[PDB]
């Protein structure tokens, strides 16, 4: 994925002349001319001279423009075309980062079109994302990529030598990776004077970026929109006469308190300007959930009562998107071939985000159901109607309880304004917001930056792999530095994962974990899934921890669902293996045909949509492992990586590799039916098992130890998903080993509180094996290749076989 980077930037006079002549021919080309007239309508085009002069005269510049300004497709072109016009065309190598893969591809393909060229193929414009590229010509070129690709590039060339201009787009989004890239770039530019840096924001709050970069020049590009009418939840209900089918810590609590206090009076005044039935329906509305039936009813109204145009729907996540898609397709209206209904979500297959293609006649109407990714520059043609569900998925991090969650939260005003602007690019539009007027007045101006709300482990490994020095020091230099407590927790988890040594340097395991673009506990799990040849069930479990588990509890069926779930557990005493068995049973049912598949899901109360998403994530995980050289195939099911996939002990040991140090000691029950099942933890004292767990009532445990992933605190701490494991799993994959005796007995302690009976020689064996495993992983840093398990005698097989023999007890 580094091929463009490794190219050397070498200006050429002959190429300068040739490109200047290429421009002359383009000026006469009907195709090019037609495209130029489209461009001239964009506000960016009109100030092109001042943008290029600012960039040419200053090393760092900040560009702000709102929706429709055209910065993302235009500014790269302005630089290249200015160089070409000046007879310096070959001196340009322009790289522009995008927040998502689909944006990189879509923008690059659109710019190629506007230049009357195909994308890649040695032409002026192309893209690079992980494992897929259309690369432009070496000199006088534009490359769209992701932030991830730049971070990868910095491992190979930390100077970004051959780049003349780096354009960081959509910076207002404040993604973790953008913030770090920004600090890295700031350090580089001070050292190398020939790099131009251009920072682009879609919102007008960009002064902070200018200050960060030393109060560098700023410039504004006007947005472009036709007028868009906005509707609140009151207006929508009133307009369509909606008939229902039925009937993130302290500063959120503050805002809800204010909402609650202003609620009665808001409602009271609302009865002044709206029908009584509207207010009563609005009053019944659930704030926690987007109402998908309302969205269906609104789409129905638009189609029947309003003018032609495409409809864009914004929903928090995959669950909502697939649910609304099924809901629409279950109505004979939308079954027609005059509707095209397209899901858009970032974790579906690559150009399975299919929404770019020229839509076929407008006798057929496009309905795009998308996440917040449709807010960015993406080609969706002819949108007259935007339905804003009002929510966005956000990660939050409770550092006092060490709990990280993903939830749907209210959009900011900036989000809402971007969604509004999507309806006004073609003709006068309509944007329907599913929040009420009181909610609107209480939205935040902007979202809190990710760096403040997110676990830092993945970022910390990036810092180390890029040799940026001390972790806490670097993080303190970011534009918004994270809290000390988030930093201390992050560094601690990485040491307990054995990713960092006590001196905060990468271990060989850590090097490999840094090469996997997932959280390190997931990375460690899938890595040992690869090394131990468990791949398929381990990837299932990993996907399940990353998104969520497939089970649902329908009303009235609670007791029945719990029994079916425990049935799926069999004797494993594992929530994680329960998901494996569910998943395998589902796949087997799928082969027999869709009746059997739906049947299986109703029998075990499984979400088909969740299962499908888990399956897609598995493929991704395998791709990451293939690129890191730990598997030879992109198939989770590849026979050679699955020889151990039926072995319960081996899979359990891999789950333990991933989830340590989240470890609990069982408090023995002693046939007391009046006492809840509880467990001891290092950090939290005695806690409870969640009722959803297959172990919640278990009296029969074969070992004394659990590992868990999800912890929640309501009136007290509950463990959501846990797996019984043998002490040998903790012994190999856990913390420091110590030996103690007490007379007769040989004792081993792991991280000092995990204490069990075991011969002293086992402790020495394990210390030996850990070091041999380090050396194995060390050798693969420079020469990554999958372990060949068909060659015994190989000494990699010897070491890994010995580890497997140990954790089989
Ligand atoms: Cl059933």
Automatic annotation (TrEMBL):
Q: Which keywords does this chain's UniProt record carry?
A: Acetylation, Activator, Antiviral defense, ATP-binding, Cell projection, Chromosome, Cytoplasm, Developmental protein, Differentiation, DNA-binding, Helicase, Hydrolase, Immunity, Innate immunity, Magnesium, Metal-binding, Mitochondrion, Nucleotide-binding, Nucleus, Phosphoprotein, Repeat, Repressor, RNA-binding, Telomere, Transcription, Transcription regulation, Translation regulation, Transport
UniProt GO BP? cell differentiation; defense response to virus; innate immune response; regulation of translation
Catalysed reactions, as listed in the record = ATP + H2O = ADP + phosphate + H(+)
Broad class of where this protein is predominantly found: other
Please report the stretch or stretches of sequence annotated as the Helicase ATP-binding domain. Answer: 52-222
Q: Which GO CC terms are listed, alphabetically?
A: axon; chromosome, telomeric region; cytoplasmic stress granule; cytosol; dendrite; mitochondrion; nuclear speck; perikaryon
Which top-level group of life is the source organism from?
Eukaryota
| GO-annotated molecular function | ATP binding; DNA binding; hydrolase activity; metal ion binding; RNA binding; RNA helicase activity
The protein's location, in the record's own words, is: Cell projection, Axon; Cell projection, Dendrite; Chromosome, Telomere; Cytoplasm, Stress granule
- The protein's required cofactors: Mg(2+)
Domain Helicase C-terminal intervals: 297-467
Name assigned to this protein: ATP-dependent DNA/RNA helicase DHX36
Source organism of the structure: Mus musculus (Mouse)
Q: Which gene encodes it?
A: Dhx36
The residues of the intact protein that this chain contains are: 158 to 981 of 1000
């Amino acid at each position: 994925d580094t091929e463009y980077l490794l190219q050397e930037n070498e200006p050429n006079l002959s190429l300068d002349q040739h490109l200047l002549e290429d421009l002359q021919r383009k000026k006469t080309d009907p195709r090019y001319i037609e495209m130029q007239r489209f461009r001239k309508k964009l506000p960016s085009y009109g100030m092109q001279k001042e943008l290029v002069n600012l960039i040419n005269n200053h090393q760092v510049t900040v560009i702000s423009g709102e929706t429709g300004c055209g910065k993302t497709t235009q500014v790269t072109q302005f630089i290249l075309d200015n160089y070409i016009e000046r007879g310096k065309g070959s001196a340009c190598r322009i790289v522009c980062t995008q927040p998502r893969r689909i944006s990189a591809i879509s923008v690059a393909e659109r710019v190629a079109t506007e230049r009357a060229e195909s994308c890649g193929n040695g032409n002026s414009t192309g893209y690079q994302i992980r494992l897929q590229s259309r690369l432009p010509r070496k000199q006088g070129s534009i490359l769209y990529c992701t932030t991830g690709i730049i971070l990868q590039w910095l491992q190979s060339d930390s100077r970004l030598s051959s780049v003349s201009h780096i354009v960081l787009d959509e910076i207002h989004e404040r993604n973790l990776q953008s913030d770090v890239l920004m600090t890295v770039i700031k350090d580089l530019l001070h050292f190398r004077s020939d790099l131009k840096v251009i920072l682009m924001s879609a919102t007008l709050n960009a002064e902070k970026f200018s200050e960060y970069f030393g109060n560098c020049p700023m410039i504004h590009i006007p947005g472009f929109t036709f007028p868009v009418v906005e509707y609140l939840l009151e207006d929508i209900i009133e307009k369509i006469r909606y008939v229902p089918d039925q009937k993130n810590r302290q500063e959120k609590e503050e805002k809800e308190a204010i909402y609650k206090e202003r609620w009665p009076a808001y409602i009271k005044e609302l009865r002044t300007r709206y029908s009584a039935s509207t207010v009563d329906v609005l009053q019944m509305m659930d704030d926690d959930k987007v109402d998908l039936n309302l969205i269906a009813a609104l789409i129905r109204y638009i189609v029947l009562e309003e003018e032609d145009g495409a409809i864009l729907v914004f929903l928090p996540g995959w669950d909502n998107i697939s649910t609304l898609h099924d809901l629409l397709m279950s109505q004979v209206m939308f079954k027609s071939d005059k509707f095209l209904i397209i899901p858009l979500h970032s974790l579906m297959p690559t150009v399975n985000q299919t929404q770019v293609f020229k839509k076929t006649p407008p006798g057929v109407r496009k309905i795009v159901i998308a996440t917040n990714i449709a807010e960015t520059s993406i080609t969706i043609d002819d949108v007259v109607y935007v339905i804003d569900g009002g929510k966005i998925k956000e990660t939050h991090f409770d550092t006092q309880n060490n709990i990280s969650t993903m939830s749907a939260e209210w959009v900011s005003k900036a989000n809402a304004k971007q969604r509004k602007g999507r309806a006004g690019r073609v003709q006068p539009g309509h944007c329907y917001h599913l929040y009420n007027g009181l909610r609107a007045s209480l939205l935040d101006d902007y979202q809190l930056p990710e760096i403040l709300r997110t676990p830092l482990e993945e970022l910390c490994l990036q810092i180390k792999i890029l040799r940026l020095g001390g972790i806490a020091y670097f993080l303190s230099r970011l534009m918004d530095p994270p809290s000390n407590e988030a930093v201390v927790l992050s560094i601690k988890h990485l040491m307990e994962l054995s990713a960092l040594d006590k001196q905060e340097e990468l271990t060989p395991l850590g090097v490999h974990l840094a090469r996997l673009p997932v959280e390190p506990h997931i990375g460690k799990m899938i890595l040992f899934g690869a090394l131990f040849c468990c791949l398929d069930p381990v990837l299932t479990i990993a996907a399940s921890l990353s998104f969520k588990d497939p089970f649902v509890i329908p009303l009235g069926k609670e007791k029945i669902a719990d029994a079916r779930r425990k049935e799926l557990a069999k004797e494993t005493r594992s929530d994680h293996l329960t998901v494996v068995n569910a998943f395998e049973g589902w796949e087997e049912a799928k082969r027999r045909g869709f009746r059997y598949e739906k049947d299986y899901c109703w029998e075990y109360f499984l979400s088909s949509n969740t299962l499908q998403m888990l399956h897609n994530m598995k493929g991704q995980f395998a791709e990451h492992l293939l690129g890191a050289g730990f598997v030879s195939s992109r198939s989770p099911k590849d026979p050679k990586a699955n020889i151990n996939s039926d072995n319960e002990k081996i899979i359990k040991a891999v789950i333990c590799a991933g989830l340590y140090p989240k470890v609990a000691k069982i408090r023995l029950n002693l046939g007391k039916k009046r006492k809840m099942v509880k467990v001891h933890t290092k950090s939290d004292g005695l806690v409870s098992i969640h009722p959803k767990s297959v172990n919640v009532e278990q009296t029969d445990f074969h070992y004394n130890w659990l590992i868990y992933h999800l912890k929640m605190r309501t009136s007290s701490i509950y463990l959501y998903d846990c797996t019984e494991v043998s002490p040998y799993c903790l012994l190999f994959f856990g913390g420091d080993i110590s030996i103690q005796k007490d007379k007769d007995q040989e004792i081993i302690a792991v991280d000092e509180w995990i204490v069990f009976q075991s011969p002293e020689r086992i402790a020495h064996l394990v210390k030996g094996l850990r070091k041999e495993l380090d050396s194995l992983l060390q050798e693969k840093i420079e020469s990554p290749h999958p372990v060949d398990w068909d060659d015994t005698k190989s000494r990699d097989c010897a070491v890994l076989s010995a580890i497997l023999d140990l954790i089989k007890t």
